[PDB]
From a paper:
Aligning two subunits across the designed interfaces revealed that these were designed with high accuracy, yielding alpha-carbon rmsds of 0.7 Å, 1.1 Å, and 1.5 Å, respectively. In each case, the rotameric states of the interdigitated hydrophobic side chains at the designed interfaces corresponded well with the design models, as did the polar residues lining the periphery of the [name] and I3-D12 interfaces. These values are comparable to those obtained from previous computational nanoparticle design campaigns that started from high-resolution crystal structures of the building blocks.
Here, we develop a general method for designing self-assembling proteins that uses predicted structures of oligomeric proteins from thermophilic organisms as building blocks. Of the 359 identified thermophilic trimer homologs, 191 yielded high-confidence AF2 predictions [predicted aligned error (pAE) < 5, predicted local distance difference test (pLDDT) > 90]. To evaluate the accuracy of our design method at high resolution, we used single-particle cryoelectron microscopy (cryo-EM) to determine the structures of one nanoparticle from each of the successful PDB seeds.
Author numbering:
A (entry chain V), B (entry chain P), C (entry chain T), D (entry chain 2), E (entry chain I), F (entry chain E): 1 to 16, 24 to 105, 114 to 142
């Protein structure tokens, strides 16, 4: 099984005590534990996220974990990108207790569980 | 006469039975029929569309056909880019029967006529 | 694919700056672009239009584009002629922003797009 | 860091397609990924859970994950056992979307995330 | 003292009689007068602005002047980028007399003073 | 281009941490930046301000920046002096967030921007 994790704008500035590299290592260590392959991606560009989602359709990704950051509350382009790949299961993640445009085009949401929310989302895709 | 056709985010995933390459062939074939030159462009980046609109002003484009996709419903930056080039006539196009921020800064809109909407828009710029 | 274009009374007096021969050249050029065969016909006689619609049924026309002119608002004979050939898809076209008796027996209407309305109608029959 | 996972009555009958041994392997694999030691325990006896909670106090467990099953809705004895060890952080977990007596004596609850809820709870204790 | 000036989308099309190169020369001349070092940046990409703000945090910039253009009215990503660097003082600028999402995360706003608004904003950071 | 800056009563006691000599150096440095000649004048006498405004008319000053201090709230003589030289553009400046008699006989007011308000006013006279 192959999983793709997508982080939106500003997420790389976690810790600015756990930082973004701590979250990446927790995700990569959990992937070995669950016996899955994982790719982790972050960008500040809305278009680079849409390109990464379109690349996932051509690369047989088995499921997607996404944290859009602030794009959750205004990016109808990322909503419609997630709607264009409806064959792939996706879970939306929020680190803090953040109405949203990307939720109804996803198979579930995890909110307010801190850095543990990604680990639930990966578990929900293995189930 | 030189026409520029601009496609917004997600439009390259048409048919994911007619697809995006079928639409490009229909536009390029119709340009020869109308005896005009055409450039067709697509990007998932909001800033690449604004760069392409600014490039058109320095390149003596005679008219613009634009399908913003989802940016129609939230991109005040693309609205104000179209407002900055008021000397050039533009037609907005929607493939499906989709309130919009980009409409009042254009000379017309074509809506819900499928892939035929681009062919009306090219005709309306020749007239 | 074979297309038939029918123009009603008075349409030959367009431009009495684009005239009727400009419209015929736009249609014939666009047909090569879309890789289709096209016949363009005009008459001032209501009965010659009904004869042309009956001829089309015996000639394996794949789709019809029609602009009835003023007959749109009173010719129940042309309505019932279009109803008699229900196996063939037809699009109704109006050049200017014109209740209509011929619309409910057609697969769609295109209105107020100038001479561009024929090009959308040909696109909608290829789709 | 040392974690203790406690499962209540009936939890060993999961899958009577994922079963209880699948959940134990997911937890043990995730523990290696997070670089923590884990003990996983299940019993049908209310008193054996209270003995295990009392043993944890003498064994320097750094955090507890607990799924009481039905005891959530009536066991004031397990509530008061969790209250007696207030120096140790605990997270409560429910597999399905199950008022509760054990919740207010814990640092958090995770509900309805399936077998993924344990993985969030371990993350929330590492954070 | 080191100052960073950020211009958003469309600002490079000022005067399409003073233009964007006049504004850059006024800012660079004023910086020598105030005895400060200045960097002036412009982009049409929302993500390139967020990258430039994140780069400023690693480069010990003493204060920021920002004119977001249209992003002022919808970019919650640029708002949250400005919030992520709260150690650095920022002034927001609007050339024309433009409710705004980026204002409450800045230490002041200058509005409707034309190209003079940048000179006040530099003064307010030297003070 | 020649600019005249007039400061009213009490302005020489700024900082009784930036003082009046700091403000004069900021103005003289900004004048070199904008490529303009500047004269800076201060007096506690209402009549010496009126003499300086009458001198400006005979010396072809291209624009005036004025901070009247408290004379803003009662000096109809300085108001009518500014009205007597309607051929010269003037900007009124207030350092702190101070109804006024001198405002309607000026081309604009700048208020509450600290010592930055003078630099905006010089920018507005070059524009």
């Amino acid at each position: 099984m192959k999983i793709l994790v997508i982080n939106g704008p500003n997420i790389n500035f976690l810790g600015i005590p756990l930082n973004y590299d701590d979250l990446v290592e927790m995700i990569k260590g959990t992937a070995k534990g669950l016996k899955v392959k994982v790719e982790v991606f972050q960008s500040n560009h809305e278009g680079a996220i849409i390109d990464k989602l379109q690349e996932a359709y051509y690369n047989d990704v088995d499921g997607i974990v996404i944290n859009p950051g602030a794009f959750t509350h205004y990016s109808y382009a990322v909503r419609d990108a997630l709607a264009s790949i409806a064959a792939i299961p996706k879970i939306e993640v929020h680190i803090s207790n953040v109405t949203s445009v990307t939720v109804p085009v996803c198979q579930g949401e995890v909110v307010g569980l801190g850095l543990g929310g990604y680990l639930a989302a990966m578990g929900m895709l293995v189930e």
